[model samples]
Target chain A: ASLTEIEHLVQSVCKSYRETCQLRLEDLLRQRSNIFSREEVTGYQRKSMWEMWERCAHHLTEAIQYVVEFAKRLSGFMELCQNDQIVLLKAGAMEVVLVRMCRAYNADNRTVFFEGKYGGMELFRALGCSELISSIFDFSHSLSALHFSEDEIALYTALVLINAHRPGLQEKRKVEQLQYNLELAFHHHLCKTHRQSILAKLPPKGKLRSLCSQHVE
Target chain B: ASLTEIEHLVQSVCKSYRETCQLRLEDLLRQRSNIFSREEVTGYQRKSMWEMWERCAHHLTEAIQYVVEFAKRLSGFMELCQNDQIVLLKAGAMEVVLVRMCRAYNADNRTVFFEGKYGGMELFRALGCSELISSIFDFSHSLSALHFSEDEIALYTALVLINAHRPGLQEKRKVEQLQYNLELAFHHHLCKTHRQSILAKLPPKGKLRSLCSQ
Candidate 1:
């Protein structure tokens, strides 16, 4: 195969990865929704935050295990020093957990599901979940609405994984370079294909570069 | 390993699958968003539906390739009569394509990214895209917000793939059994875990069953 053919093949693999990831993520979210429901909080459930914490902790631990495994498989993540690996995981874990929790958010229902039970918007606010967090979920909801395939999602995860700002990075430059390559791979794939759909237009390479520059900030 | 231990291992594999899938999908989406922008249509460049269809066809062909590969890997998809395989693919491909296209929908911005360009909601409406299509995207967006893992996603793909409703099934019962197994595997994992998340509740078996009943 020619370079272009090789690139196309690689891109194809990446696309399949993207689709599988998307399918899995979709089902995971559905399972979460199935577990959580929008029921009226009865009397005994008034002080459920304590209970909520336990559930959150359990889920977070499971999520962390997944994250560790995920990070281990990244092209360059395992190459990082042990300390750096731990540091990135620590920082990145928070975002991943928050994102996962946000997934159970029902915008139409205006409620967030916790431990297979639903809490109203008021309930969450009362429980001390901030507007910013809610807003982030809203942002995620919008981002998710965009119908990103596994390929795009994979790139996003890589972007999240390669944060140079995380403390204890022994080789910040190398890490930064890794992130840069990730960005390039992401865009390069986009540039390779015909993205034409109903609102067909060229991929916004310049816009994305600008966004990446500000992503860390 | 005991059945319980085996179950846990399977669940772990599912979680790992979910993580790998999430990474790849996230990367794909980021790449897409990077390429497509919500640009305001300038003077005289307003009429672009013809251009849009060309791109749409290009993507559709690519999607077909993915769908073919996707169906091929299904545990027993190939073992079925070739006609049944074709039947299921034909029935399920629409849902798959619709879902794929919906990924480019930006709910907050009220725009759909076609290929890599942004078309405003009004623009789409003006071009004869119906509210139903837009609504489905809304559903997809809401669905996407849930952040499901690969384990769940794999089951879902299975669910979509084994469409018992597909006409001309040589063995509808067989397909139904496959779907049943898929559902069982899904719940089995959740049930296997000591799932004490925010509500501290176990997986809602009753509720999920009710939903599945439909």
Candidate 2:
């Protein structure tokens, strides 16, 4: 029941956090210099490709904000110092967003239900960086091909959030301790015998780093 | 009646030319290597901004193609040598598109009905070059504000296509004659007393040139 309870708690918190994200149409209208009405601007009927990008970038930020809440809900994560918490979050939030992207994948059509509509590579062309979207879709395709269950995905996400190899973390030992314990819980859930191969597939080495590294390009 | 017939003919042909453009879904589908059925790819629910630009660019080409037909219908244009015809088309096709753009303007909301949907400048953001789209919109805005009549626009478009300042024309005199005759038809339609300023406003001096220059 201990490992099962952790699985249920991780999955539920992650799902709940995702659902809490809202479209801030009211705030956006209030902030715009032209100040239009919700009566007209409510739809994602955007006009520019740059606007389409800003839309996706905005939702990606929203998803990142919820990751903090999900992290705080963890037993040991709340105990980390303010600096350590921020550092870990700054390091890992983008990784979490990438992991979350796979959940929206529709392998049948090879499209993602991203931001608002279903689209393939062509929709994201506004970023002017084909490599980034290609990497995103290719990564999503490979991960979806493996077909992880909800519990395994939750445990994987939990480990990713507290992975602890980041610089500038003051409570390094505690974060490492947190990482180890989650893996123990992960092992118990994996019948105490999950292979290196399964771990490698669960989150490929440098894959998340490579995905986040797209910011520099 | 002579001026009246030219005005009627010019306006009818321009309107018909604009209407002949179609979305060639079948050809696009046949071209793709990983081709799928019409059932899925038909709706332009296009995922990328680049795809949207290509759609607009494709339609713009279609509009230019029909410009030849409308030019052929003109009394003098058919007599030009093949070289002159190609040179004039290369010079004038884009200007025709800008004039055509005004016909789709929505002044009340400051948006243009372009390609397929109603959009403001934002829909065109994928061009990677903002200056070009901005110039197109700014020109459309100004032209729509002045609000030229349909006959005026028809005459204006004819004058633009056959304007004849282009280089390497074998039939220079004939093309110049064609341009002068269009202006005569334009003046006769204007009751033979239109001003330089009105002509300036109608196509705008270097304005159609500038708009087409985009």
Candidate 3:
């Protein structure tokens, strides 16, 4: 049961996720501490804590909505029982969201753009939210440096979504098989071209596992 | 109407708060990245996210407990209705905890001694945390450099607690008056002794306000 036939299906899903999320993600990556347009500054001048919170709240809601829609069309996801679907989503959403964030993150400067305003490290400190952002930034820095393609991100997202560890997984073996198929395809694709391809030669598999587990934690 | 008599009172409260929390705070500050003793590393080796969360949760719980205890002896706080006392604690607790962390901070390296481990920027990055630590690191760097006396820290903590804009304050005027008294005592004490004291000339007033506001 080669999942390779749905490689295009995975590609399409990745395309849609990117299209839905790209602009916002890019906007966050392009955020700068000292660089600003006059319009950007004016727009942020009226920003308040309530508005900031709402913007974050709204962005997350939109991301969740997009993930739900994407999951419906996902090959392995649609094959699972409905209960399993919910569990997988609940279990895997953080890593997917993190992957999405890391894909567009700019590592050099410690800032993230939210709700149309570019905020630096100082802004979060004042809000008592340093630990979370630091972790995201670090992950993003490492991941973005890898320069993975859309197809790669999609496969990893799919791989992350399938979980044997999730409670109430009715067909855990099936889920694991599906994950193994995806992993096989990912490694196969990576090795198909060159002996020294970037993905094949990048961080050790153990490190990647640890990184993903941290997100799960 | 001079609240200067409360100076010793504030000092005493600070002493108790320190006595209560100093060891735990030092335990966190004593965390080292790779230089851990066997017991320290053993304690931290088993730490997972739950334990990390618990450590922070316990520290905050202790801070609130001490704040509540200190509030009982604060004449100005006691004069307020119970509502204002809660409001001040809620509003000012973050700054107080941040101040406490800053006091014991070592800024040469960017690690924070939290739990039984010394965690650096890389640890925060691995944990997906970024901005808050950076800001804290920056604040700690500046504050640790200044080397203010414990009395100075106590006065500032006292001043921060009696904020005028705490959302649920029943007596804004009362809070403001207490704030003014502490500010007066803080400034008076700074100027009364040495005309050229570093504390008096540290960051300008506006800068201090901005830093505190942020």
Query: Which residue pairs collide in model 2, if any?
Result: A47-B122, A47-B123, A48-B122, A122-B47, A122-B48, A123-B47, A123-B48
DockQ of each: 0.01, 0.00, 0.01
* Least accurate 10 contiguous residues by lDDT in model 2 chain A: A27-36
Clashes of each: 50, 7, 10
Q: What is the TM-score ranking, best to worst?
A: 3, 2, 1
What does candidate 2's lDDT look like per residue over B72-140, in tens digits?
766667788888888988888778767766766666666665443455666655556678778777887
The 10-residue segment of model 3 chain A with minimum total lDDT is A192-201
Tell me the tens digit of each residue's lDDT in model 2 across A114-212: 544455666665567788888888888888877655556666777788866898987788787667556545543443222213543554458798888
After TM-score superposition, the amount by which residue B2's alpha carbon in candidate 2 deviates from its true location, in angstroms, is 99
What digit string (tens of lDDT, one per residue) describes model 1 on residues A139-216? 555544555555655555565666776778888876765564554444434433322120122223233333223222
| lDDT score at residue B4, model 1, on the 0-100 scale | 58
Kindly report which residue stretches of model 3 are placed more than 4 angstroms away from their true locations once superposed.
Answer: A3-13, A19-51, A193-217, B1-214
lDDT of 1 by residue, B1-214 (tens): 2445435544543543343231255544564444333344442136576765565567667766666666676555667788888888876655554444444555555555553455554444433556644555555565455444445455554556666657888887777655545444444443334110101111222322232233
lDDT by candidate, in order shown: 0.51, 0.63, 0.58
